[PDB]
Amino acid sequence: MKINIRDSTMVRPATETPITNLWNSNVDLVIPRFHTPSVYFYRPTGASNFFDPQVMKEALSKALVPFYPMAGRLKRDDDGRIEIDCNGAGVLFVVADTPSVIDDFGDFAPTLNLRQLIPEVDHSAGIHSFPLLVLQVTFFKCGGASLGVGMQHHAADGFSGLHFINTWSDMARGLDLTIPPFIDRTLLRARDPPQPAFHHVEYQPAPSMKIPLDPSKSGPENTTVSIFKLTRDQLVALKAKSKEDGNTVSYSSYEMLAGHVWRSVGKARGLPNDQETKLYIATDGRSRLRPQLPPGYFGNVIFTATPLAVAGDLLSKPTWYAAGQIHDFLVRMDDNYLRSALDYLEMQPDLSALVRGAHTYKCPNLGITSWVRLPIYDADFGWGRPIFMGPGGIPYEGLSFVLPSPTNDGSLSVAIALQSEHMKLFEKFLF
Ligand SMILES: O=C(/C=C/c1ccc(O)cc1)O[C@@H]1C=C(C(=O)O)C[C@@H](O)[C@@H]1O
Numbered sequence: 001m002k003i004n005i006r007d008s009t010m011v012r013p014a015t016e017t018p019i020t021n022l023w024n025s026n027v028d029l030v031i032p033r034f035h036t037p038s039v040y041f042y043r044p045t046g047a048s049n050f051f052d053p054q055v056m057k058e059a060l061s062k063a064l065v066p067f068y069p070m071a072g073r074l075k076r077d078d079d080g081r082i083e084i085d086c087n088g089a090g091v092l093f094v095v096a097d098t099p100s101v102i103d104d105f106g107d108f109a110p111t112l113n114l115r116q117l118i119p120e121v122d123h124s125a126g127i128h129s130f131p132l133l134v135l136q137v138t139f140f141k142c143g144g145a146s147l148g149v150g151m152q153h154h155a156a157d158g159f160s161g162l163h164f165i166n167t168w169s170d171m172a173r174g175l176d177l178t179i180p181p182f183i184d185r186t187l188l189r190a191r192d193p194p195q196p197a198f199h200h201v202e203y204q205p206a207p208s209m210k211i212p213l214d215p216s217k218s219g220p221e222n223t224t225v226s227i228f229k230l231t232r233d234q235l236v237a238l239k240a241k242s243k244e245d246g247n248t249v250s251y252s253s254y255e256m257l258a259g260h261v262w263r264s265v266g267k268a269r270g271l272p273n274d275q276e277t278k279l280y281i282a283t284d285g286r287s288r289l290r291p292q293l294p295p296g297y298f299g300n301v302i303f304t305a306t307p308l309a310v311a312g313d314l315l316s317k318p319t320w321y322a323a324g325q326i327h328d329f330l331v332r333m334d335d336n337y338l339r340s341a342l343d344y345l346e347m348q349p350d351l352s353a354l355v356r357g358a359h360t361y362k363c364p365n366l367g368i369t370s371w372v373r374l375p376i377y378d379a380d381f382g383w384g385r386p387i388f389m390g391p392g393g394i395p396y397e398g399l400s401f402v403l404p405s406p407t408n409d410g411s412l413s414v415a416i417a418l419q420s421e422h423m424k425l426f427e428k429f430l431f
Pocket residue numbers: 031032036038149151156157158159161162165280282302356367369399400
């Protein structure tokens with residue numbers, strides 16, 4: 001797979017936008033470190049029109065007016081806290097061609113070479129030196145096209161990011177903004193003085209391997225990225241296994257599936273029985289906060305659930321015990337818990353230490369982030385909804401994504417990075 005860059009524009013908002021410094025909340029900071037990668041694939045309609053760069057760039061310009069922080073830069077304030085400099089510097093927009101065809105990607109596992117569909121960002125220079133959002137339209141030999149998105153994590157979680165990408169697609173089709181973005185993260189400010197009510201397991205360091213891992217089997221260089229589809233048959237069977245061993249409790253489809261992936265990764269890694277394994281669950285707090293955030297709220301509302309088990313229990317007990325741990329952590333996260341979380345973060349001297357990253361998800365642990373409830377298939381720019389949308393790469397061993405079906409057949413996909421030798425075994429997930 002070879003990419004030939006054709007054009008490259010720094011697209012700025014269509015009109016003047018507020019010059020201001022946009023404050024980041026604590027959950028805007030403890031978010032992962034770079035640009036969240038996502039990719040969209042589109043069949044050709046047969047039209048010459050197809051993903052016309054001018055249409056895209058003009059629509060992008062317009063959308064960058066209500067969503068003007070998206071065209072800003074990272075900077076530090078006087079106390080050294082990272083904030084968004086709303087300077088309207090612009091968004092990088094690349095047009096590329098490739099002799100490859102879409103079908104060459106087979107199943108769209110977010111491998112390294114799929115990452116090639118998003119432009120690369122050099123973070124090693126200034127914090128201020130790179131766009132918050134990088135975009136690439138790649139035209140394939142088959143007439144199809146892909147949209148690679150790389151959005152700096154401080155700017156937006158999935159709900160706010162797709163609020164922009166979809167408003168953009170709407171604007172490309174001549175439509176107007178629907179829900180205007182609410183741009184003020186101070187709603188997620190910690191109380192004064194802070195007052196944690198809980199011990200937040202989610203922000204305690206992840207279990208390490210009791211036995212150090214072989215750096216030739218472990219590490220970035222010998223990790224595989226695959227995806228797997230589960231049919232609604234397999235999912236229905238899965239939720240029904242809540243019955244097993246006389247358990248009367250009914251857990252959610254997401255709980256049983258997450259528990260199943262967690263348990264299946266555990267078996268695959270051949271963990272010792274006394275080894276602890278921590279599951280990281282990105283959790284939208286929009287529905288839990290009880291004053292309740294405005295529609296269009298622009299930023300991160302990601303809070304974090306972290307069920308934990310000893311592999312001995314996790315692998316020997318039925319799947320619903322895993323579901324139980326997950327449920328027990330998810331159900332505690334009401335508004336009172338999330339307010340605690342903000343206060344707890346506030347009382348840490350160095351938030352950079354809590355920024356989740358490779359060390360967070362790597363074996364013996366696991367991250368599972370659900371995109372199932374995200375409107376990922378709504379980006380229609382005038383030539384149809386995408387046939388596929390998922391992560392643009394999974395850079396961290398141990399991180400995984402749950403994607404919804406592009407066709408509403410009740411199937412789900414798990415996209416995941418594991419160490420090579422564990423990946424084959426991880427088909428054990430189709431038990
Ligand atoms: O899900 C997201 C971002 C999604 C997103 C999708 C489309 C966009 O246009 C913009 C953002 O962030 C997550 C944060 C992580 C965390 O909180 O640990 C764990 C990671 O797997 C994951 O990337």
